Amino acid sequence: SQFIFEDVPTFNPEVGYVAFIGKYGQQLNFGVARVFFLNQKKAKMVLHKTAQPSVDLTFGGVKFTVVNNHFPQYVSNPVPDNAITLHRMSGYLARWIADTCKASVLKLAEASAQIVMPLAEVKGCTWADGYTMYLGFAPGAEMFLDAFDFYPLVIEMHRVLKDNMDVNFMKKVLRQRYGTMTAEEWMTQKITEIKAAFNSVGQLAWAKSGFSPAARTFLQQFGINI
Amino acid sequence: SSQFIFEDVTFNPEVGYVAFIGKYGQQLNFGVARVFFLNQKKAKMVLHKTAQPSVDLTFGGVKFTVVNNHFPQYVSNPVPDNAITLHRMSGYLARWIADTCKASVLKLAEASAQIVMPLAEVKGCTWADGYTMYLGFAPGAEMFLDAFDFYPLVIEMHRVLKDNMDVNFMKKVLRQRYGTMTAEEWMTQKITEIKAAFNSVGQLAWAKSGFSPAARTFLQQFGINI
Amino acid sequence: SQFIFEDVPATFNPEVGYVAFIGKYGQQLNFGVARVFFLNQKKAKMVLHKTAQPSVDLTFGGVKFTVVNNHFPQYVSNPVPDNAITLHRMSGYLARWIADTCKASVLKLAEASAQIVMPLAEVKGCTWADGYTMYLGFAPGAEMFLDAFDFYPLVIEMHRVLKDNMDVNFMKKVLRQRYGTMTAEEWMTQKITEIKAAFNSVGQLAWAKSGFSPAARTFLQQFGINI
Amino acid sequence: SQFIFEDTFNPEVGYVAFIGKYGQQLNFGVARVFFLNQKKAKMVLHKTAQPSVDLTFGGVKFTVVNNHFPQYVSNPVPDNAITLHRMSGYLARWIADTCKASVLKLAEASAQIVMPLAEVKGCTWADGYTMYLGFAPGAEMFLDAFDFYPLVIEMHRVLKDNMDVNFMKKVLRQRYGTMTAEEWMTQKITEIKAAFNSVGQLAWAKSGFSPAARTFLQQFGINI
Numbered sequence: 001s002q003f004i005f006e007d008v009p010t011f012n013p014e015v016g017y018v019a020f021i022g023k024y025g026q027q028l029n030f031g032v033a034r035v036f037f038l039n040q041k042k043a044k045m046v047l048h049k050t051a052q053p054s055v056d057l058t059f060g061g062v063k064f065t066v067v068n069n070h071f072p073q074y075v076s077n078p079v080p081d082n083a084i085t086l087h088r089m090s091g092y093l094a095r096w097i098a099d100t101c102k103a104s105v106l107k108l109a110e111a112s113a114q115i116v117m118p119l120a121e122v123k124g125c126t127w128a129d130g131y132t133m134y135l136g137f138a139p140g141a142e143m144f145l146d147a148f149d150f151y152p153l154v155i156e157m158h159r160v161l162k163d164n165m166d167v168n169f170m171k172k173v174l175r176q177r178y179g180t181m182t183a184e185e186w187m188t189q190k191i192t193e194i195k196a197a198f199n200s201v202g203q204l205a206w207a208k209s210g211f212s213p214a215a216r217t218f219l220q221q222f223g224i225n226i
Numbered sequence: 227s228s229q230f231i232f233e234d235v236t237f238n239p240e241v242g243y244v245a246f247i248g249k250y251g252q253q254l255n256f257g258v259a260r261v262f263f264l265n266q267k268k269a270k271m272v273l274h275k276t277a278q279p280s281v282d283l284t285f286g287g288v289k290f291t292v293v294n295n296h297f298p299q300y301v302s303n304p305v306p307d308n309a310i311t312l313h314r315m316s317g318y319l320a321r322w323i324a325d326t327c328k329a330s331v332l333k334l335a336e337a338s339a340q341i342v343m344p345l346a347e348v349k350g351c352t353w354a355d356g357y358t359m360y361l362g363f364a365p366g367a368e369m370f371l372d373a374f375d376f377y378p379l380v381i382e383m384h385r386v387l388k389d390n391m392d393v394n395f396m397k398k399v400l401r402q403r404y405g406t407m408t409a410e411e412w413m414t415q416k417i418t419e420i421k422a423a424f425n426s427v428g429q430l431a432w433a434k435s436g437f438s439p440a441a442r443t444f445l446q447q448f449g450i451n452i
Numbered sequence: 453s454q455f456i457f458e459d460v461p462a463t464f465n466p467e468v469g470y471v472a473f474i475g476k477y478g479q480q481l482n483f484g485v486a487r488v489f490f491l492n493q494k495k496a497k498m499v500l501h502k503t504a505q506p507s508v509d510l511t512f513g514g515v516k517f518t519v520v521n522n523h524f525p526q527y528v529s530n531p532v533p534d535n536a537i538t539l540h541r542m543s544g545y546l547a548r549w550i551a552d553t554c555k556a557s558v559l560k561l562a563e564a565s566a567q568i569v570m571p572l573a574e575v576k577g578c579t580w581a582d583g584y585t586m587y588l589g590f591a592p593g594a595e596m597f598l599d600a601f602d603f604y605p606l607v608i609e610m611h612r613v614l615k616d617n618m619d620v621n622f623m624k625k626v627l628r629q630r631y632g633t634m635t636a637e638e639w640m641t642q643k644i645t646e647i648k649a650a651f652n653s654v655g656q657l658a659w660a661k662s663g664f665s666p667a668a669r670t671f672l673q674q675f676g677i678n679i
Numbered sequence: 680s681q682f683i684f685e686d687t688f689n690p691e692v693g694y695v696a697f698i699g700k701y702g703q704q705l706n707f708g709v710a711r712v713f714f715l716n717q718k719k720a721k722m723v724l725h726k727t728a729q730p731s732v733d734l735t736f737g738g739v740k741f742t743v744v745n746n747h748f749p750q751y752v753s754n755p756v757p758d759n760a761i762t763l764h765r766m767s768g769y770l771a772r773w774i775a776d777t778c779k780a781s782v783l784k785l786a787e788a789s790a791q792i793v794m795p796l797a798e799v800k801g802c803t804w805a806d807g808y809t810m811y812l813g814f815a816p817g818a819e820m821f822l823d824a825f826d827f828y829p830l831v832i833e834m835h836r837v838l839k840d841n842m843d844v845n846f847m848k849k850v851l852r853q854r855y856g857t858m859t860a861e862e863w864m865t866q867k868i869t870e871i872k873a874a875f876n877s878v879g880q881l882a883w884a885k886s887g888f889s890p891a892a893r894t895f896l897q898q899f900g901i902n903i
Contacts, residue, residue: 002272003272003281003282003283003284004283004284005261005262005264005265005268005269005283005284005285006261006286006287007257007260007261007264007286008264035684035685035686036684038684039684042684043684046681046682050681055682056682057682057683057684058682058683058684059684060684060685061685154448157445157448157450160450161448161449161450167433167450167452168436170445171436171437174437174438174441174444174445183438183440183441184438184440187440187441187443187444188440191444191447195447195448198448210845210848211848211851212860212861214861214864214865215851215860215864217864218851218864218868219834219847219851221868222834222838222875223838224834224837224838224844226844229499230499230508230509230510230511231510231511232488232489232492232495232496232510232511232512232513233488233512233513233514234487234488383672383675383677386677387675387676387677393677393679394663396672397663397664400664400665400668400671400672409665409667409668410665410667413667413668413670413671414667417674424675454723455723455732455733455734455735456734456735457712457713457715457716457719457720457734457735457736458712458735458737458738460711460712460715610896610899610901613901614899614900614901620884620901620903621887623896624887624888627888627889627892627895627896636889636891636892637889637891640891640892640894640895641891644895644898648898651899
């Protein structure tokens with residue numbers, strides 16, 4: 001039925017992260033994250049197909065209670081600020097690796113071996129380019145522009161420029177804080193380091209995914225550009 | 227063998243409004259309209275799915291007999307001049323709020339609090355821009371170009387220009403009267419006030435709705451324009 | 453009988469087809485019949501599309517025609533006999549019939565003027581005042597008889613590609629037609645003078661953008677909207 | 680299992696499989712019906728909610744994987760299966776191989792088989808079997824057998840017909856016998872430009888208009 005309609009009458013990522021670590025922190029290792037970031041795309045699909053508002057997903061051998069944000073019906077439902085979606089959980093895992101890494105070269109080599117960000121590899125970015133950039137490709141990492149030196153922001157700037165991503169997907173990022181500053185503040189006081197990060201990712205073999213360089217050169221000869 | 231055989235065989239919005247008010251007027255309040263305009267898009271979808279030429283829809287707690295104009299089969303069927311489609315009813319509700327408002331600041335504040343026009347908010351238009359423009363975004367408000375100072379007309383001119391709306395959806399509007407004048411008349415005698423209204427809505431953060439001014443300046447520096 | 457595909461097994465002279473048409477239905481015709489046909493042709497095409505029967509009996513005015521169902525999805529590609537009538541052919545024949553019936557009497561021309569309406573002509577602001585060959589020339593099928601309609605069917609279609617941006621491939625057929633005794637390869641040369649004349653004549657019709665008055669199209673231009 | 684996460688196609692083998700299974704039942708009448716109804720069959724597949732379906736062309740029943748129903752597009756296809764696309768390619772290859780070796784056989788094909796996609800662009804058996812059959816969907820799998828025609832034909836659709844360029848991603852990954860795409864893009868540009876130039880002579884948008892008709896229309900400012 002419902003030929004009847006009636007009236008429809010906050011989130012701090014830094015606290016959400018501390019909550020996340022509080023609950024799952026002891027059980028984490030790079031094997032877990034490796035599996036998460038290789039299967040994040042897959043997990044989003046099963047969430048889409050599954051009619052259950054919260055579900056228990058297991059990556060590596062660690063079970064996470066995740067809010068189903070993706071099943072058609074639930075997209076518009078409010079999410080609690082101490083919950084995790086795949087997006088948040090992606091951001092938190094990325095932050096966790098970032099924090100774990102910086103403080104040891106032994107730890108950085110371990111991550112380099114285990115962890116893969118498809119979204120980074122597609123654009124020809126690797127650990128050699130540095131953890132903040134490489135991990136910056138992870139969904140959710142825009143919550144922590146501090147920790148990833150603005151890479152998440154500039155990476156999304158390039159997708160609209162080069163890959164013709166819809167501009168509206170940047171609305172969110174441009175509301176984020178940089179540690180203690182407002183977006184309305186760091187857009188001003190941080191353009192120097194932002195243009196630097198922008199220029200740095202701008203050096204990555206970014207590609208029209210699915211045409212090799214040799215294929216582009218080939219087509220040019222018959223007057224076809226991409 | 228009844229249709230393998232062929233042989234031989236004007237709506238006034240101002241009277242329709244009076245009819246509408248005549249029937250449903252006593253039961254209206256801004257809460258009803260609020261629910262209507264928040265769920266109009268939804269109601270159009272259920273009408274599309276529902277195989278029943280007239281249906282009883284209830285907004286707030288008020289039941290309206292509405293002609294199903296949207297189910298694939300019924301689009302081309304003639305509609306009586308004392309009936310209401312979602313479109314008409316949207317127009318009448320908008321007109322009712324416009325008339326109710328103009329005459330009192332107390333009444334205008336009440337509407338400002340209760341009523342939301344998604345189509346206005348998407349393009350960054352609000353009550354602050356004035357009731358004629360804001361309410362002008364409501365479907366059906368083109369019936370009353372008088373009452374909404376041509377806004378409904380120019381708004382649709384911008385959608386074809388900026389949003390690449392199909393031009394054929396303007397056929398109807400360009401047949402409307404402006405109080406006592408024919409479309410063939412106001413297209414001439416009213417281009418000055420029309421270009422003014424056109425220019426006014428042309429100032430609304432159309433694609434820029436949801437990007438602060440500081441965010442737009444920021445993106446410009448990396449050659450991204452909104 | 454839907455996961456199964458099978459049977460698939462170019463002469464046609466419109467002037468003989470017309471004689472056949474008249475031979476069979478001629479005695480029963482009058483302008484009332486045609487009036488109903490041309491007002492309902494579009495409707496009849498839709499019911500043919502919905503109806504699963506390879507030939508059907510359609511009745512316009514009070515006259516029953518055996519018409520080959522060319523339009524039902526399944527039948528589009530099957531061959532049509534040269535002594536059969538589709539809605540297209542029948543439209544052409546009816547138009548020819550009215551043209552022939554008219555020319556020979558002013559009394560008869562007035563009768564047609566009162567009865568018969570060509571939607572496709574009225575949309576572009578053409579009327580009987582402009583002359584029967586032009587007005588009737590708008591009828592589908594009339595390109596079969598470029599002789600009888602002084603090339604109007606051909607030039608009318610030239611304008612739809614120019615002004616209305618019609619697909620050019622719908623002209624393939626017309627450019628293969630004969631002008632009485634001449635080949636297309638011949639009248640494209642020997643008849644350009646009268647063709648440019650006909651072209652120019654229809655080019656004077658208020659070729660209105662369908663659904664938008666001329667004043668509406670001028671208006672929108674001022675805000676940089678073109679149709 | 681679905682909530683738990685822990686840690687190839689060779690057209691030449693597919694063809695051999697295809698022939699292995701359906702080869703004895705084939706004839707030009709079957710292909711004729713397939714290629715005239717391929718567009719039709721794609722539509723019914725789209726409407727039909729059944730991941731594999733039995734389609735019959737001429738009087739031969741083929742088990743075909745439904746690649747087209749909205750839900751199934753993204754599902755992996757086995758390497759020994761046939762989609763309409765593959766099956767189109769294999770049939771085209773089969774006719775190509777069958778023809779080359781006999782003039783009697785070529786005349787039989789000429790009479791029976793029609794490639795709509797070729798006829799639309801004014802290409803016929805007179806232009807040669809490689810080019811004509813090259814128009815068949817799936818024939819890009821065998822750029823060897825059809826002398827690069829499938830590839831250049833698709834280059835023209837993006838140039839002349841404004842086809843979306845992304846539909847060329849696949850073709851540009853194909854092998855030319857023993858070479859990689861990364862190889863023949865270099866070593867074969869001479870023969871590729873030749874094939875490109877050859878199809879570039881076909882009455883592309885002019886199919887169905889005599890020369891005299893084109894000259895005529897020019898006079899009223901209509902160009903083909």
